[PDB]
């Protein structure tokens, strides 16, 4: 049957790193269960355009009143009931993704299952920041290869790319290796990035502007290493436009950046229809976000290891009662309905900057 | 939660037209409920390449053995379990679509709801065959426009095309009007087809070879009326390819032709990502197939009316208890879990020409 | 010479329409003069992605702190000083545009003059909403053509487009006529839009998604009426990309949408280098925003009339002392340094809903 | 306020090299200040098409009478008051650039500032003529690298290209290195220039015809080293056409060749909008020209070192009172209003071939 949304809480928590990450949570209540979801927007607009002040005002002033008290058939009907407003996909994702968790919980079904996935474990990789030299780079890869991560991703920048990559591929001729070019290059760097070709990178991630496809397409003609799009694919139509333009052959898919699970599955499916793989990206999420990610990642076109590594890697103590730990580069799907994870309300209370309840 | 398929029945009915149409039914038994689906392949290969003989043989000799006694999380796992066989998409669709029905009934949710649709009714048009003349054409169109159908599809051929279109368009300058060109043309006829342009057809459906994309793309550059693809799109990647090529601006989506609901969802999603609409096509289904179609038609990119009109247009007595009648061009979604319709067992027995049961 | 920004005021006004429109003002204090600019972001994201909540938070928590107490050679140095934040171009524009005003008043030169414009007056048209019928449409158009406005923009939708255009064009066969298609169409409607071609519209404005370039380019190849881009061009490189793609032949340039005057100059220059004209769009500004717009409109590639008509069309009482009235489709450039207009402080106080002051 | 142009002097000086360079100067007088500028045309048409006899006749017979006695808002209004005449951009630049110097001086503002730049130092590189062999080439680079020039440019010709480049890159694996192909090659040399690719040149400058883009585009497809355009970009629309054609990815921007500062900023901005850098080129200018160049070069898309090296390198004694000397490859922006440099009228008098004064 249909679900009624009775109440909503916005909880903003400041979780200690391992200084702090501000974790914005939306909890939707109805049918005697509750769905939970995590904002990935930051206080300032650094990774992308949205902000917490902006997203929270939109939630409490526009999205929650649109849905509070209304009865819905599915999560897609919740999205559609917002619908008119422009951009702000992370903010909408908070509502859409909590609706998915709720929906699934009223049915007793794991989230991944409802989205059509059927993996029990998902493969995971690790992202390495810039290290001080070649051997420091190689020694850190060596460790991660040893813990059995299944893809290695290196941050690179102009002046520091060919070197860490050469040194890494020399030591590790067979590993799945990618780089994060982090929007730091221009077309003038084409001959420099082309030097990466001989090292057989799975891909180079978002080398040019965060909101561009056209130039990425031109770059992709000038070097043989595939391009991966991150910030510049924020919808299924973006993915369609990207792949048809040759802007890339790989997508770093982040569920919240694109609007939530429905639209993510759409991006996933559009990519598969070009035979391009996706992987599930990370945003330093708390157990709430991490768990949504793992559930999404059970879909079949997630054919490259995702950035959902062990929570112990980020937090001394997580917001959820369950530990999300990868072993040998496989992260198990948390058993249970919906996300299969559960807030630790008392621990949460110790780290809550602010909370509010909304009703109809 | 998870479901175990215990038994399967193949039941072939011969249903008299208002001489006859063969209806191959698959019934899957699991978890105290059942799933039912209808084959759309014919005795002979006239609409496409599959046949009843071959499809049934493939069900009993390969697909059923692969699933009987097995346990599954979702219809996706079912399809996954069928192996890497080539083609035979309508055969696969019988199992896939029955599994969706079964799955959804284990959960007590309507099928459409689980596919992401939230429409409570869907818009329908009708397809008229060739009339003896312009006036007979207009007459027949008139009866239907007076029934409130929201699209009229006229069959055409050389050199019976501009006439029935011009006659019709003159009498009804506002109605949504398509033609079905029945793969009866070539690139040589482009000039003739271009003459349709001034009559504001929504599209010309599949005028060239049934399995072609490339010539269609060439034809689309020569005339202004959008083309609509049918036989040519049997999967989400065919859809991708069609639309990237410019082979069509519209797809006629037939759930069983593409392998079933999940793949249909994807086709529909790939279209929408190109800004191409779909509609739900028909294959003279009994109420089983028809209920399946109606559910699928609730997804939001079915923005053009479906070939999904009234049961009583085709059959004095349908195989289900529920009436599926459209009023004023609107088909209501049949209520209840899964497909919302129920076999009339007694009546079905009177028209059964074969049946078998398979177990683990 | 160089200028030091000492203080900043954010003053939010609620100005009654001739119910209301919120006007966020930024006032920068330096070197004995002040600079004033008006935000064009709304309470909610309806025209675009930014919101008042998010923009103000970004001003007080990031942009103002970055500038207060600092010394600058030009508005360019100011923008440069704001960091690499993503998006939020209207927020940036408040600071950028206030800095231009401040800068120009330290020099005693009119703003337009410093941007390279030398026109003493600019041409303006108006935008009409949807009328109940053809005759009401013509009527409303008639009142404006009799005011001497040099372009008439009609809002359109399916299926209210060809009628008001044909009605209007029949009554006024000579007037410059555009439509605003309000992102309410898809590639499917191309045939419908093509029917506008024979009515010699100067352009069709943004008929597809608000953030799209690629589909627009495809649509432009299907119809002869130029397309004009609005929401889709938020910077000089977007403009480059739009025009290289063939996404439009005309850009509707909104100074704040692109991040301010310098970037507007550049957008205008990039257009002109492709032989594409621009015009100055509007966002229901008070006299502050409107004066900013008029100044910018003096540059030589604003070759099509701007959405910049009379203050008294919108407000019984504007926030500035000076009248900004157009006669016969000509808006005179308001005299004096910077923007040439002056806040009516007493009146502003009566409509102020918030204010804060920031210092070093 | 506006400026009135009262008088103009044309002074032609023969400055001793270090036999002579003919230096044509225009001095515009008004508002009690004066703006000065330097012709870059030569007695004969060698670098480009204009000549001194031609340009001076145009100045005294057409441009000065157009502007003498007239009052203007800005330099752009001065350009526009010429406007009808075709080509002759260096001649127009003399008027346009002196107007900029004047304008800025009536305001008390450095020229670069008014054009929106805010660098205090600009980076500089050195151009090397053809040397007799590899080591003579390497020994001269070594010197310049040591004086800390930030880019090295080698003249090359057929028969002498791969060799000096190989020998240079061997000795200097990391330096920013370019070549001047000086319009001396043809498409038949494509395989030969392709041999430069492995040496990671920042670019190859104007390899084919001085007035061509189309062939340069074809060449750019055949080799991986980027092309830089010099003579063939004489306007903002040229730059737009060049970059959109793939004729090059870099522009050698010479202020006078393109018409002066406004149009230069336009070329600068068009390039930036393709993410292509420009640099400021040289013409053996006297302190007058050199100073205009340095002021222009403070703009942000001048991201490659310019050819404005130390004046002591060219003249035993310069026309201006101020020394323009680069130290460690940084050239400081001369402080002061306008160009920040000042004629030495008495020294000038010693080297004047001819002078004239014009009034209204």
How would you describe this protein?
This is part of a larger assembly, with four copies of chain A (360 residues). Chain A has 360 residues and is α/β, with parallel strands linked by helices. The first copy, chain A, folds into two domains: 1-108 and 339-360, Enolase-like, N-terminal domain (Enolase-like, domain 1, 2-Layer Sandwich), CATH 3.30.390.10; 109-338, Enolase-like C-terminal domain (TIM Barrel, Alpha-Beta Barrel), CATH 3.20.20. The first copy, chain A, is 34% helix and 19% strand. Chain A has twelve helices and 15 strands. The first copy, chain A, has helices at 52-67, 75-80, 89-107, 111-115, 134-146, 162-171, 190-194, 214-222, 236-245, 261-273, 287-296, 345-350, and strands spanning 3-4, 7-16, 20-30, 33-38, 71-72, 121-123, 126-128, 152-155, 177-180, 203-205, 227-229, 250-253, 278-280, 330-332, 352-359. In chain A, strands 7-8-9-10-11-12-13 form a seven-stranded parallel β-sheet. Chain A has a four-stranded antiparallel β-sheet with strand order 4-3-2-15. In chain A, β11 (227-229), α9 (236-245) and β12 form a beta-alpha-beta unit. The longest helix of chain A has 19 residues, at 89-107. Chain A is globular. Chains in contact: A-B, A-C, A-D, B-C, C-D.
């Amino acid at each position: 049957r249909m679900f009624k949304i009775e109440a909503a809480e916005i909880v903003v928590a400041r979780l200690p790193l391992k200084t702090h990450k501000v974790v914005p949570l939306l909890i939707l209540h109805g049918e005697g269960v509750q769905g939970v979801a995590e904002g990935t927007m930051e206080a300032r607009p650094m990774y992308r355009e949205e902000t917490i002040a902006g997203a929270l005002d939109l939630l409490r002033g526009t999205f929650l009143p649109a849905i509070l008290g209304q009865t819905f058939a599915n999560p897609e009907a919740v999205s559609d009931a917002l619908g008119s407003y422009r951009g702000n996909r992370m903010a909408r994702a908070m509502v859409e993704m909590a609706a998915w968790d709720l929906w699934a919980r009223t049915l007793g079904v794991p989230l991944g299952t409802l989205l059509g996935g059927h993996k029990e474990q998902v493969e995971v990789g690790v992202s390495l920041g810039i290290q001080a030299d070649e051997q420091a780079t190689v020694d850190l890869v060596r460790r991660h290869v040893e813990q059995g991560y299944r893809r290695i991703k290196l941050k690179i920048k102009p002046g520091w790319d060919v070197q860490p990559v050469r040194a890494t591929r020399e030591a590790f001729p067979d590993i799945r290796l990618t780089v994060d070019a982090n929007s730091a290059y221009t077309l003038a760097d084409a001959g420099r990035l082309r030097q990466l070709d001989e090292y057989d990178l799975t891909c180079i991630e978002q080398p040019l502007a965060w909101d561009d496809l056209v130039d990425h397409a031109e770059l992709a003609r000038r070097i043989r290493t595939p391009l991966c799009l991150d910030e510049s694919v924020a919808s299924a139509s973006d993915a369609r436009k990207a792949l048809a333009l040759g802007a890339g052959g790989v997508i770093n898919l982040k569920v919240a950046r694109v609007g939530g699970h429905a639209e993510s599955r759409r991006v996933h499916d559009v990519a598969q229809s070009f035979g391009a793989p996706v992987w599930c990206g990370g945003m330093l999420e708390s157990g709430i976000g991490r768990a949504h990610n793992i559930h999404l990642s059970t879909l079949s076109n997630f054919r490259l290891p995702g950035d959902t590594s062990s929570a112990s890697r980020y937090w001394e103590r997580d917001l959820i009662q369950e530990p999300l730990e990868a072993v040998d580069g496989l992260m198990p799907v948390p058993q249970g309905p919906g996300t299969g994870v559960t807030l630790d309300r008392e621990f949460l209370a110790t780290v809550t900057e602010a909370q509010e309840e909304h009703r109809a």
